[model samples]
Target: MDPSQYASSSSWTSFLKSIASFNGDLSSLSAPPFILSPISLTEFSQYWAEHPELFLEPSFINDDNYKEHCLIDPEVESPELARMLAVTKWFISTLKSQYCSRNESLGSEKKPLNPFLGELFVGKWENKEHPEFGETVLLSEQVSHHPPVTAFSIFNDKNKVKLQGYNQIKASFTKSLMLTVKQFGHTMLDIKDESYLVTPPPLHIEGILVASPFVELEGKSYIQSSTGLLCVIEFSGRGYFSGKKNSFKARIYKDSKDSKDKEKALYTISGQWSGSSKIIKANKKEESRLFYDAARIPAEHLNVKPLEEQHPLESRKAWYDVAGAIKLGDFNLIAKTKTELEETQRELRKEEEAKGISWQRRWFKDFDYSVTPEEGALVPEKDDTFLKLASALNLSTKNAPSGTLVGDKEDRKEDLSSIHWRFQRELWDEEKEIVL
Candidate 1:
């Protein structure tokens, strides 16, 4: 489709000018109708769990007594190395879903709908490759609106793996008119008592003036496990003025200590994260050998609750009308429906202020983080609402990925506002219909 024809000629130029000239809060700027995405930012959390199998395979470390810091100790069978490789593979796996999906699915990078505070999204991943491991469930909530942070949890209790994290993007326009995103957030992974911490890479948009835009991830993000191991990943753009986009290099170290020498790398990961990434390990004479190929790995789909059964505030349900308009190419309906939702949210916020009662999040909560030994650097606080909720419910952090929502639609008495959500122990099956 020719995007220029989707809006008035003046609207396109104004949108580009505003993007290039603006320096902060890109979320507040209006864009041409053609570049709007129907999905909400809350739903973007699912990209982290689209491929769940890679995260679970580490448990195949069938040895009898596996230590907590398995990756540090050298072993003949090397269960530690296998576990570390799986963690890196899983982290690399999410790159495609998080940064490239919109472009691949819609043919271009588009602006996702901003999520409202207290908004929620819940779903699961089913893997045919390892069905016995049970469903990999995911839960997400819009924890903050001012800075716009989305908290998420994905776990497979049967496999004993869970990931909890939250993120907020700070955007700015550079001298070259490129939009740069500084992502602020950290993810924690748990396998039994072991934990790993990882941060996201920085991203920038390319070709904003040419009318065709896409995302390019740059800079370095690190993954540090509680066991004293770390992976430093460096990202680069098409070299100087040539080469492929989305290129990166990663190295896994035996410990988190600063390594001044490149030869200290136990495992090296190199390739284009959006395409194929390879893991190469050093043997006897320090010769590198192939370990893992990411492009060869398959991605699984996340199965969400049916729209009919979803609460009014659930991501898919709330954005229903707007998304439908987008899919059908009816730009007028898109604006009308989007306005209705935004207006209702504004009115709700006004009511909260009048009543002096802040809105409460249902399943997940946020807190300031600090670094620790048993947990990791940037550790989840002991007083975090998540820990209290988990302990009160007598549930392991792993099982907390799925929820049985707390109250009924009419049960909210005071202001009586919000979306649909309920926590539960049982999960759901996928239906084969597409919603607008």
Candidate 2:
């Protein structure tokens, strides 16, 4: 089933023509039936923890199990470096699912359903066969609608490993119909007492003219640790640097202004993220060995509550009819069901407006950039640790508006909308108890 067959169709050609004039609003891109996905963007957060074993690897550093595996040389590498490498490996392993799984499972990169504000996606990974693996839970919510931000938290209670993040995509199109998507925001991973801030890389869609679009990551991403170790990854695709798709080169080094002046690296990892990667010591005394093989490790399945048991706000339950119509290729039914859901959401918003209230997010809170330390708020407007990591990586904090501040009341309100979303564990606990 070559996807290129669609390229010759009049509908795909018109779609390409429309994309040429796309105004950067991804939601407005009326994709043809074949390019519509049955899943919503809210479900994408699960990609980060699909490989529970790898996601939990950093927590095992210096432990008996890690020592038995001997993945890193104990005599030569410090535990911090080993753990950093493990974290880097886990990040690389997630790229396949994050950007390529749709192509593998759905035949191509299809447009995911845009989630409405307050939509939730909750699930857990039950490592039943591997008792040591433990259970990993995920809670994802669409906390904003204007700019469409999704906040998520994934944690393994037994291992004490937690990852929290929020993301929003800014997409645009070129005259050539290439769709470029720049992801905003970052993730914070906590393993025991250690914390690491991870940034995402921007990506573009290729082969659109042939109707077989796929994602290719570009630019650089960073993982900065609380222990002062930083891993910088640079991505490239076919005919760019390595003449291979999904190729990346990463270097791990100490965090310091003078570290680059020293021109020394602790380790270097390179290869295709979707296939295999190898790591080598900086001294070149040891040969490079296989580090992670994407094909070798299978992602653990996520277990979700049945639709009957799921709350009305859950993603699957809310979009049930729409998803079924899309799967069955019922274009008219898809449009009808989608409109029904959208109308219901509109009614809810109208009710909230009449009541003078806003939609309540379940497990996340948006930061108030307007709050100052002098205000004596329980949660500060700025995250000092996140700021430090962002500065180390030369990335934008995205906490405040760029340029000088304006005094206009309306302007301040607009600036506040740029604030970051953070997971509130206390809220989660309170809601969990009630749900139970």
Candidate 3:
């Protein structure tokens, strides 16, 4: 398929012009109708747990009580190594849906609709046939409107596994019209008492000039486990030495003073993340074996409540008309519906302002950086686990917002809006009890 065919369309040409002239923020871009995605950005959180079984694999390990249901051979590998490998495989599996699903389903990487503050997207992955797998619940919310951020918590109470994170992208167009996106924030995956802090990879849009845009992940990402192991993954795309798209090389090593000391890595995994990857032990003479095949394992479908039963703030319910307009390719209707929704939101904001209140997030709570240290003594401190992992990985704390990382306390004090949002488990439990 030659993307040039679409280039002939005046709308596409105009869209390209707009993108080239656009500022850093991607959400503010007024993309053409053909390049618009009906789904809101809030829905993207489900990508993290598309495979509930993989998400719970680490929990099954090291549990003597669940020896019969262990996913890995205990005699072959250490529990820590096995869990790290499982986490790496699960992370690789998510890449296909996260970066390529839009191209597969919509023929391009369409711009997702910007979610309004307090918007929610909730669903669950069912495992009725495999009781051992257990069910995984997903809760996503748009906690920040300015410099838009989306926070999500995916958990399986039965397995005591949870993944919580928040992310916001800063995108800019290069001279070649390539849209480069740098993601901020990180995720913490907890399996019982063990936890792994995972950082996001940067990506760029390819084929932009031809009007068939697609995402290509680049740079490196890290997964640092509390068990003193680190998994570093380096991403590359087509035209690289591998001559393959979505190529990645990963290694797991014991915590070292220098992160670049890959010579002591225990295991190495390499191949296309969107396809199959092979893993080999660094010291073992045995042949490399297949680790994960994204194509072979299909993602579990998320079960979301019907719009009629969904709350007014739920993403799908709130954007029902706008989504329908996009699907129908009704440009006029799309603009009208969007404007109407925006107008209503404005009124809500005005009402809240008059009452001296702000829009309250449904499931997440934001940290209050405005209080003095002495005054904040009564408030719970921010999680230091992320800071520790970031330091161990040599990640720059400045890349993320103020309160998200350690250091720069004085800077955080200056920027009151630079607060972190975290999932509140007690609030969720209370809400469920009331609903029940």
Candidate 4:
């Protein structure tokens, strides 16, 4: 982990360490992780420079093209840009779309679902990714336990009276069409998993084979010594990576070595994402999307040690906490267990109080979100494939966290007994009425 020995800067290594620690191997038990993302700013500029729509444009038409608009519209553009980069909300739409129809006739675009779990352990190595290590004690790629958590956070003040963003206080009227992709998603992949945070280097000695001066797995070599001893390491994990999504584009704005604002071109990304459902749709249609905006560091700076100036940890990731109650109604699907239901209700209340914000919670059973999937267009999810066109703004998935996805009567009823989900408003009221 020497600054000079790395092909990349120690900063990159430090950032990688942070990610690893965030996932595990570090905690309050470790120093507070202040590391930032590996994404650099210059790359973001190049991306936004190519895709201007990602930035908010001036209200003017395509004449002179608002050449001066960039300067005059900083505030407007910044906000608009934020919307374009609404990763969490778009992620939600992806899952939800699986249940709704296309709204194109209404001039609607793709509607996706909320990535309830964000990136999941959808699949992994059933076999070792590194078979070269002569049978290491590692679990095959599939055994890698999926990390725990949703990476992002979002709060929907449905009656929003303010702008739907992080800046407003009690932003009810504006309704934060907030995104939670980062809150739960990232934690499952990085944080609690001990892979997201970072810390000081492992204790190293001058040169112990396994204990100190660890060689890159790929860099290891035979000592060509007469001794029968040997050490072979297999790198199954990159340890640090900016994973990909169907079409979530990340941009940056760190200042470059050649620019006055060297840090600007080195810090962030600059692109928009595809519709939540649209990204998944593209995947099914066999489209190859190159998510090329990450796993990089800003260019070196004067007196700026790469390892020391790690990426700043986001105090808050994009995430949301949702509370809902449902009525079982006449549309009975599963046998109700009053005792179990009460236990779960108690736990849910804890989650609500932890968030410390007032909001309504109710279940919706009799209503129909199932018909949503029968559309001119369709998308696939964990449980079933359904219509999730964006214009119509719908989503569907198995045990989905967003909109209701209980299929027709049978499917809805089946899910009730087999799975936990949102059902009816009456059922919600019933639960509320009986709760101790």
Q: Write down the lDDT of every candidate, Cα atoms only.
A: 0.67, 0.80, 0.78, 0.20
Give the candidate number with the greatest lDDT: 2
Candidates sorted by lDDT, best first? 2, 3, 1, 4
Q: Write the per-residue lDDT of candidate 4 for residues 361-433, one digit (tens) a residue.
A: 2221111234344343222343321122211222122233222223533235444322211222243236422
Report the Cα lDDT for residue 21, model 3.
64
425, model 4: CA deviation in Å? 10
Please give each candidate's TM-score.
Answer: 0.79, 0.90, 0.89, 0.19
lDDT: worst 10-residue window of model 4? 162-171
lDDT of 1 by residue, 1-436 (tens): 5765543467677886676557477665657677888889998888887777667766655455444323333342355555766788778888888888888788788888888887888878766567777878788889777758788878888878877777777788777767777766667677766666666777788777666678888776766665566677788867533266787778877764443456888767677887775555643434444434556766676887788888776898988988899888676887798889878988889999999988876655333221212232234546543444333322223211122113422232343222212222232223122221
Judge candidate 4 at residue 370 and give its lDDT: 41
Which should have the higher lDDT, number 1 or number 3?
3
The deviation in Å at residue 111 for candidate 4 is: 34
lDDT of 1 at 275: 75
For model 3, the run of ten residues with the poorest summed lDDT = 65-74
lDDT of 2 by residue, 219-249 (tens): 8787889888888788998858778889998
* Clash count, one per candidate: 11, 0, 0, 119
Stronger candidate by TM-score (2 vs 3): 2
lDDT of 3 by residue, 1-436 (tens): 2345677787777877777669666755667787889999999999998887788888877745333432333344467777888898889988997888888889888889888888889888887877987778899999987768999999999999999989888788888888878787778999898889888888899887777889888877888898878898889868666678899998888873534687778788888999988887775637678878898998776889878788888899899999999988888999999889977877888998899997777778765333342344223356666656666765444435312334455334443333456788987887852120
Best by TM-score: 2
| Higher-scoring candidate on lDDT, 2 or 4 | 2
